[PDB]
Amino acid sequence: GQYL
Amino acid sequence: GQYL
Amino acid sequence: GQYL
Amino acid sequence: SPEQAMRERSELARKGIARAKSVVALAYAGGVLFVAENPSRSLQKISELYDRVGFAAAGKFNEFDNLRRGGIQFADTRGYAYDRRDVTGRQLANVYAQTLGTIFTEQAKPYEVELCVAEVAHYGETKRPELYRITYDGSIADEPHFVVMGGTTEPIANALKESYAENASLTDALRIAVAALRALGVASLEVAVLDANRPRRAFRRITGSALQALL
Amino acid sequence: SPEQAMRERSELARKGIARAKSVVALAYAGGVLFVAENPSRSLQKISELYDRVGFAAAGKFNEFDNLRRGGIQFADTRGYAYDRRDVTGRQLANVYAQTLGTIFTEQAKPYEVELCVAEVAHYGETKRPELYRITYDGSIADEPHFVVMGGTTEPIANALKESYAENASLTDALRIAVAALRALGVASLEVAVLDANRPRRAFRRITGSALQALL
Amino acid sequence: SPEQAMRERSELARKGIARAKSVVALAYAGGVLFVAENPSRSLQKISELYDRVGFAAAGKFNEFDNLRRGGIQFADTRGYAYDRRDVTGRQLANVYAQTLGTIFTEQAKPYEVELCVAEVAHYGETKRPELYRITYDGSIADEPHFVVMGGTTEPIANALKESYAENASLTDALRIAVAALRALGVASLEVAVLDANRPRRAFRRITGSALQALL
Amino acid sequence: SPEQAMRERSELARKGIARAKSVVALAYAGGVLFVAENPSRSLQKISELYDRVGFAAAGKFNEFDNLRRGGIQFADTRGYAYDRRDVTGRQLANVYAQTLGTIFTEQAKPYEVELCVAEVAHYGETKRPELYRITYDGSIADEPHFVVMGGTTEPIANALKESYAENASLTDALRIAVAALRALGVASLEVAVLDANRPRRAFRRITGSALQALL
Amino acid sequence: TTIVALKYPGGVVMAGDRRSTQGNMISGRDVRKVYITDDYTATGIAGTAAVAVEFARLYAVELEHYEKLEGVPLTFAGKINRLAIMVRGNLAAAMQGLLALPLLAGYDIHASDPQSAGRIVSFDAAGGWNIEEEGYQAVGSGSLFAKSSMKKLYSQVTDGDSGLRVAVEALYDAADDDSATGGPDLVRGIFPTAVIIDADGAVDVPESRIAELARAIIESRS
Amino acid sequence: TTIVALKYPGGVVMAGDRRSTQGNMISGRDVRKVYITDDYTATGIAGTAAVAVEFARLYAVELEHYEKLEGVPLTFAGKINRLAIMVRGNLAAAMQGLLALPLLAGYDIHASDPQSAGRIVSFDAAGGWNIEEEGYQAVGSGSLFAKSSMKKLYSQVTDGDSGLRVAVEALYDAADDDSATGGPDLVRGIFPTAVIIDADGAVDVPESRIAELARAIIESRS
Amino acid sequence: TTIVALKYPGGVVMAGDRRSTQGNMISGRDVRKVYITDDYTATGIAGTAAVAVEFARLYAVELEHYEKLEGVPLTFAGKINRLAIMVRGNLAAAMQGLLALPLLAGYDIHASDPQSAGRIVSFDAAGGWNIEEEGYQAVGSGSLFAKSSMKKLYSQVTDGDSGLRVAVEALYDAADDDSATGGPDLVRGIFPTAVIIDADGAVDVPESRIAELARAIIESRS
Fold it and tell me: Which of E138, G53, G138, I15 could form a disulfide with G97 if both were Cys (CB 3.0 to 4.6 A apart)?
């Protein structure tokens, strides 16, 4: 998760 | 890629 | 190749 | 088959790169401008690497962040051994590419990252800003005007293609970059410059009230 | 089966060699001439190896580049242990072949590279230029006149077969080499010589305005 | 397939997180309040990490407990090398996430844990409490008001959404937190605070008769 | 099955041995004569091993060449420890066989090589030349008159069977050996002798104009 | 060698002489012994010239390295600690003769009162440090004469400029009573070097100002 | 031994004598102590002959090695640093008697003013270095006599040739007052060696020119 | 011990005495100190007998080993280098008393002029070497007397034989003035050993020739  |  |  | 597996890996990497925040870097009169779409206040995608060398990235934060650290590491030791003016954006751009290629070939998962290394001239000297883009496989490309990383790059790249102007001031280049990036709000914007006019450390963040006034 | 796998590996290597920029090396009056089709300004496919030994390559840049570095490494240490005039193009040509064969047998992917090691005589001595071609498997071939590497080698090799002339001057050999290479523009050309007339370091790049005047 | 396996792993982790006691952490006037549903008297899910940094967790006790220990370890050494006021909740929150991601990728079973790192300001200074939530994959989220971990988080999160009030006293925030947690009895409750008014060590448990009087 | 795999390995080795240049070694009045069909001027298939011990090989150059080096290595150290006259053709012939067998059993691909170790007597002593043939598996055979290695060995071995004469001079043995080898041109011939009349180092190449005059 | 440092209301000043000797022989007439290690700290080092320049360089590197990794400079306390650890590390070589002692001047941006945010810190060969609180410090062969001069002259310090003049004078007396410390060379035009740190950072005093102060002192004594 | 180096407008010159002794015994009448380490730097080394020739060789190798790897020579600053690190590395053996001190002359192509791009750099046994700015330097047993000669003769230096003559004379006085330094041997025809560096690189002065200058000096003193 | 070597037009000659002592006691009357290390080099070694014979043996092995691996002998420069590295390696033991010094004579086949392709090379205990150019060299306890003899006798050298006679005479004077060097023993018939190297390689001079030369010298002095 927490893609950026 | 970038074959040379 | 280069058999010898 | 191995070839099929390689194709699958490439597709996976492409997907990872695609689902990410977009970053742009472009040359302007005073140096280079990084403008990234970043909501968090602690996690950053733009960083100083050395005196005149900056760095932006897009993908998976822990990995691109890890490269950030590796790059910082190499420059300091090299400078100490020889000197500060010997570390160049070119050498750093090269190191990342080789490392990425070897790492991908021997590791399990490829780094879903896209890198941009930027360099400006030193104080009291004239030279054009250099932008390099390093992709996940190790490929490296020399960009004359601007780099766009992460997300859907086509619309932003085209909007920049129409709006770009060499020797644009800081405010104009900021307007162009935010506009092409929209293709937003004052909040959640990460903006920094490689100001060629600074004596030594060129990297400088532009945050808060000053940024609001500029925009 | 293992034999089938080996055949597949050979085919893959051949494909890798085929999709690449073409390089030529030929003997002329003043030594040896390297002419490569190279668009980038930073990435190079022709290099000094030792005082009178030059090197050209075609394939995957990171790998051929890596061999470049390994070759540079071996010569310096050897010279320090014994002497400069003891390192010869022959010994270097040999090292690459053995390394390549062992590496291919024990590694995962074969190096999609093709190498050419060149040597000229020392100052104030007479001897014919020597060209060796080392292929991806470890095979090494002794060439009397010219080597062509990477891409489609047949048309270039034939055009050179008709145009080649021993003891051609530098300008004539450059015209012949560019012409047979076309089978181009002033930009994106990497040209260097092993000038036999230099006192010690024979390798010398020919770039920019002088090259334009010559062509 | 690998993707399918990854999906299965995520589902397993989710199931592990779901079948667990619920913990809440919320900001109130004097700092941060941890209220967990805990029957045992020896096994604890809330802990001091450093002078002003607290820690709550939900999942598998041995693992979350193990992280607890690792976090304690890192802070002491860092403080000794530099200083106490240099260790921040942010650095610790970051370390756990990176470790968790790497560990999951290289290990066999993912840690069925959910973490919350809390920080308050030092003595005689004004600053808002910071709450971070770290999930099993390495994701980290910045929370302004409250974190809910483990079990069914929806009803508790909504009840808190209606009842939350900034600058609520200790008793009101305790009532709100126990009420939203019910969505209980004096026994089996683990309650602690990060009291911003303490001179150095801010963490302080609230147990027994005093707690009963408060409730 | 393992037995089937072993049979396949043997067949592969046989094929490798078959597609190669032919070498002959035969006894004559002054010692032993090596005559090989060799086009290259740099790559050699006949070599000095020690004062009175010579070596010829047929197969894959890098491997037979590698054995050449290993054999050179063992003799020098042994001589230094004990003495020059203690190293014999027999001990060397033995070492190669054991090494080959062990290597084949533990390695991936068998060495597609065929070896011939030759020895003559010292200065001022009488003793018959000894020829040993070591095959790829480790087998070793004691030959009284001549050894033929590589390619199609039957016609050459038979022609030698009719033409061989003990105590033939150097020119006659050269004619016999070239004739039976044909079953050629002055160029591409590698000829050397183990001249028993030399004081210490018996190995001696016969190249160029002198060879042409002889033939 | 001699390096003085003194606080003034609103800042700190740090000055050092220029001579470097080997025994009785004057070997360097223009060495710079006071470095700007960062935007709020300057460092003087007395002692073996090699060890000195190396200390200064490496410490500056380390301060800036942590700053780049963490996004915020260390507190003045952390800086003090790292310098102390370096000094403690050179102890074995200092017993062998390669001794180097640093004097660290800084301006704490986080201090409560800006008028007293100046900071002077002194070290011994064993890495222990001490935060000076009587307003001034010095290091080197002339340090005792310099301190005994500043004790009397220090009531005159009221701002940046008067503090600078007092620094230059203290150096003049150090050199006047010790031969290893060079005074202002009027013939070659070589004067002490000085760094001023206040709320706005650290700047080198340009040579002309030091030249005028030195000429004023020299004419006062004639 | 004695090796002098002096800047002249537009370049640098570096000369060295030829004698090598063991105690009172003259063992070498034609040693060459000044090497051309690269196209813009020459290096003289005084001290133990072995350590000297080794230093020169290895340093030349390293300069050229980095040049081949990176495609561009180091700056004059980097060169200074590497030489300094080598010198610092020999310190343990220098205390045991195997001391070797280098004097480095170079022509900075990147300097702003070409007329003052000349560079002279001196080292001690502990690796510290100093960029000379009074126009000349020397090393070896005769260095003091050579420097005291050049201090007086240096106003005569106006170009490459006058600078060369001043170099040869300084050597002549070194040898005149010290027995370990050889003067021009008129009998065997052995003269000091000299290297000139300017905008076009480094070239060895051919022997005839040094012979004529030496004969002019010798006749002047009679 | 004493080993002389001298060039003559077209070649080189190298001769050595036969005595080996322990203190005042004559322990060996027929030691051979000059070896033919290869077809174009001979090596004499003075000093500790063990270290000497070992040096000679191992060096010969190494020359020939590289020759077998590469298919071509080293150049005379490479040979000089390897010998020098061996000598430098024995330095620790040479300080402990096990000192061995080699003198290397060779005939360079690659030199331009055949008449001056002769080569003499001398080494010190620290591995440094020097290419002799005044035509002759010597090593050992009698080396000074031998050199002072050859300085006067050397104008007589015109070919291989006259050069040989001069060698034998130089040895005779070494022995005449030093007790550790043995002269020609007419009673037991033991004479110095000699090696001649020219365009055709290295050959040992057969004993009879040395016997006649020695008897001629001895009768000349009576």
Answer: G138
* Alpha helix stretches (DSSP H) within chain D: 2-18, 61-81, 89-106, 153-163, 170-182, 208-214
Tokens describing residue I165: 């003559």
Establish if E63 touches chain C: CB-CB under 8 angstroms.
Answer: no
* CB neighbourhood size of D83 (10 A): 15
Sequence-separated (6 or more) residues with CB below 8 Å from residue I157: I6, I8, I135, I163, I166
Query: Do residues D34 and D56 touch, judged by C-beta distance below 8 A?
Result: yes
Closest in E41, E42, E62 to D101, CB measured: E62
Say whether residue I221 is in contact with chain E using an 8 A CB cutoff. Answer: no
Query: Which residues fall within 8 angstroms of residue E155, CB to CB, at 6 or more apart?
Result: E183
Query: Residues of J150-189 as b/e, b for ≥16 C-beta within 10 angstroms?
Result: beebbeebeebeebbbbbbbbbbbbbeebebbbbbeeeee
Q: Which residues of chain G have a CB within 8 Å of the CB of J61?
A: 76, 80
Residue D142: which of E40, E62, E109 has the nearest Cβ? E40
Q: How far is I135 from chain E (nearest CA, A)?
A: 33
Shortest Cα distance, chain C CAs vs residue G64, angstroms: 9
Q: How far apart are CA F203 and CA F118, in angstroms?
A: 10
CA-CA distance, F178 to F214, in Å (whole number)?
12
Kindly state the tokens that stand for E119. 């040597």
For testing the chain J interface, which of G69, G80, G83, G207 should be mutated: the one with the most J CBs within 10 Å?
A: G80
Burial of G163: CB neighbours in 10 Å, binned 0-12, 13-18, 19+: middle
Structure tokens at H21: 């000797």
Q: How many domains does chain J have?
A: 1
Q: Please list, in sequence order, all residues whose beta carbon lies within 8 angstroms of the beta carbon of residue F53, skipping any fewer than 6 positions away.
A: F75, F87, F88, F89, F92, F117, F118, F119
How far CA E207 is from CA of E30, E117, F15, in Å, comes to 18, 21, 66
**The CATH number of the domain where D18 resides is what?**
3.60.20.10
Cβ(G57)–Cβ(G16) under 8 Å?
A: no
The rounded distance, in Å, linking the Cα atoms of E60 and E13 is: 11
Place of tokens 């020097």: J130
Show the CA angle centred on residue J85, arms to residues J79 and J89, nearest 5°.
Answer: 150
**Nearest 5°: phi and psi at E166?**
-70, 140
Based on the number of CB atoms within 10 Å of its own CB, is J202 exposed (0-12), middle (13-18) or buried (19 or more)? buried
* Alpha-carbon gap, residue G173 to G206, rounded angstroms: 13
Technique used to solve these coordinates: cryo-EM
In E60-181, where do the E strands start and end? 113-119, 130-134, 140-143, 146-149
Contacts of J65 in chain G (CB under 8 A): 76
Residue for token pair 């051979």: J32
**Identity of the residue numbered D83:** D
The total number of structural domains in chain E stands at 1
Residue G153: count of CB within 10 angstroms of its CB: 18
Domain that residue F176 falls in? 1-215
- Residue E17 CA to residue E100 CA, distance in Å, equals 15
- The DSSP symbol for J15 reads E
| Parent domain of I205 | 1-222
Which of F139, F90, F88, F87 minimizes the C-alpha distance to F113? F139
Report which of F201, F195, F204, F193 is spatially closest to residue F75, judged by C-alpha positions: F201
> How is residue G84 annotated by DSSP?
G
Interatomic CA distance for residues D76 and G74, integer angstroms: 48
d(CA D96, CA D141): 13
End-to-end, the C-alpha distance of chain I in Å comes to 25
3-state secondary structure of J26: strand
SS3 G3: helix
Partner E contacted by D142 (CB < 8 A): yes
Helix locations, I90-200, DSSP H: 91-95, 143-153, 160-177
Q: Say how many residues make up chain A.
A: 4
